[PDB]
């Protein structure tokens, strides 16, 4: 799994969020 | 970097949070 911005990619799906560097990330797997 | 629960492991520092399965995780690097 990996935090990504702006979105999950390449067949991954979002299963949560991350907050880092004052931005919202998608938590992707 | 890794989302971890309940805490960052030896040598890592917390730089944010994740939310996954309704729990708050530390975002650790």
The secondary structure of B1-29 as a DSSP string is -EEESS---TT--EEEEEEETTEEEEEE-
Following CA atoms B16, B23, A2, B4 in sequence, which dihedral angle do they give, to the nearest 10 degrees? 70
The secondary structure of A1-29 as a DSSP string is -EEESS---TT--EEEEEEETTEEEEEE-
Following CA atoms A17, A18, A23, A29 in sequence, which dihedral angle do they give, to the nearest 10 degrees? -70
Determination technique used = X-ray
Show the tokens assigned to A11.
Answer: 């067949």
- Residues of chain A in contact with residue B15, where contact means CB-CB under 8 angstroms, are 20-21
Distance in angstroms between the alpha carbons of the first and the last residue of chain A: 4
Q: Does the distance separating the beta carbons of A1 and B27 come in below 8 Å?
A: no
Q: Does the distance separating the beta carbons of B15 and A27 come in below 8 Å?
A: no
């Amino acid at each position: 799994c990996y935090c990504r911005i702006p979105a999950c990619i390449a067949g991954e799906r979002r299963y949560x969020t991350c907050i880092y560097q004052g931005r919202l990330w998608a938590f992707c797997c």
